């Protein structure tokens, strides 16, 4: 995919400290969990790195995801630091690539 | 050093199956972002890629070939193995395995040497090992040529020599044709000044590997 | 499935000269375009990954460039070494795809070939078959006529022909044909010729035998 590709490229741009401090909730990562993703990393705040992976995030979900509304994100239990997230969706995400899924 | 090696070169039946094996050195087949694919060239031909796997058995085959590829892999063995059904004539070629430079994406970076896999109905065959009969007399005071043909030989590849190697000057051994008969034919060649043809003699050292076959021919003048 | 079109399909160029490969896609590859270079018996070597990058261990005088349908690798000043095979292979998408390749051979001065013509062996001929062979020797650019008669009869489709690599010292090629007919109707025939046209030959050399006659 050619979204796909962008924002795996992105997402190495930007983890190759992001966001010092900013917790978002942990994802239990597997096939199409997009919303999800961005159902997280939209609550981060003053963070103008992550900013394009949101955008990006955007296009892969079928419907609006705003702040602080959840519907594909079932689970909020652990927090996990944005850089650690990020780096997770990576791997999820060149894992879906290499699949061609 | 990251190393691949695939297995020997094999010869398949028309609607038999090929298996491959490549072994692997200078990393593991369960680390993060490891991949071995294969392509495979036919003789004069382009590369065509068939498959490849990665450290997490995701696959990816080339859909013209799909219903007649697997490929495997087994960490433990440091091994990955292609197999292809159905085999046809136009299957010849030499198969490559060979790293994925990237640990998502598709291009090559450490290769095996290659394998030459021959499709065909035909037996192995040794050669037949005729004279190229030396070109003038040796008192006519020119360059002459003289050579071995090396006929009829199935599957490739054969390899010559000259004088056990130590006449390497002037050897021209020509690429192998395939004959309408299904099997191969070259010539080996040499040029020398008309004058050693009194004096030195001259031996092609043939080599088929596949058929076990070694000759030794002696190119003299033709006693005219 | 993405359609690589490599030009030209040979290019010959001198060493210290700069050099020009192209490698069209039939669709946007954006920049994903890689690069091998292949010598003869070997397995191809990665030198450029997705379209410009240079990969380690290849020195600086190969650049790729281009994105989208259209990329060039580029040589500043050609060394021997770098006279081989080249392919394009995209990694934008599945399936992945290969050029046809452009093959970059040595222009050197033009050399005439020495020709020589060998008759079937007696061995041979016990067998039922006569194998007729002309050599052309150390001779540029690539492209030779040979033109078998038996008895002044120009003969056509009856012959095979190779060609051995460029010469590593001299950047000559050398030519092989083999002209094959029964025993029956070799026997039926006296002379045998090969006539070669080639750019260094201010006239056809005509190489010959007469059956029987050594």
Known sequence: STALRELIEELVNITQPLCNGSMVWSINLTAGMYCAALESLINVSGCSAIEKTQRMLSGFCPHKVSAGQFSSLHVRDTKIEVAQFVKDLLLHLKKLFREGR | ?224 | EIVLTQSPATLSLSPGERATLSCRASKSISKYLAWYQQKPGQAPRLLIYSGSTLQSGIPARFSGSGSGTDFTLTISSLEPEDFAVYYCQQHNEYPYTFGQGTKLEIKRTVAAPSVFIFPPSDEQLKSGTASVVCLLNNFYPREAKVQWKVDNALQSGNSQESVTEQDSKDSTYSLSSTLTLSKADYEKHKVYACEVTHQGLSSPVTKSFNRGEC
């Open chain 2, 1 to 224: 050093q990251v190393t691949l090696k695939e297995s020997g070169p094999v010869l398949v039946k028309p609607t038999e199956t090929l298996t491959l094996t490549c072994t692997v050195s200078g990393f593991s087949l369960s680390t993060y972002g490891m991949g071995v694919g294969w392509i495979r060239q036919p003789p004069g031909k382009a590369l065509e890629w068939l498959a490849h796997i990665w450290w997490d058995d995701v696959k990816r085959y080339n859909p013209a070939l799909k219903s007649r590829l697997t490929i495997s892999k087994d960490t433990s063995k440091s091994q990955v193995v292609l197999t292809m059904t159905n085999m046809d004539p136009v299957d010849t070629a030499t198969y490559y395995c060979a790293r994925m430079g990237s640990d998502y994406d598709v291009w090559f970076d450490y290769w095996g040497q290659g394998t030459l896999v021959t499709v065909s109905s035909a037996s192995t065959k040794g050669p037949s090992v005729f004279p190229l009969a030396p070109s003038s007399k040796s008192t006519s005071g020119g360059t002459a040529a003289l050579g071995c043909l090396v006929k009829d030989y199935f599957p490739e590849p054969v390899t010559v020599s000259w004088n056990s190697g130590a006449l390497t000057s002037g050897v021209h051994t020509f690429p192998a044709v395939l004959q309408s008969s299904g099997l191969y034919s070259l010539s080996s060649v040499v040029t020398v000044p008309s004058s050693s043809l009194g004096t030195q003699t001259y031996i092609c050292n043939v080599n088929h590997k596949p058929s076990n076959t070694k000759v030794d021919k002696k190119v003299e003048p033709k006693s005219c």
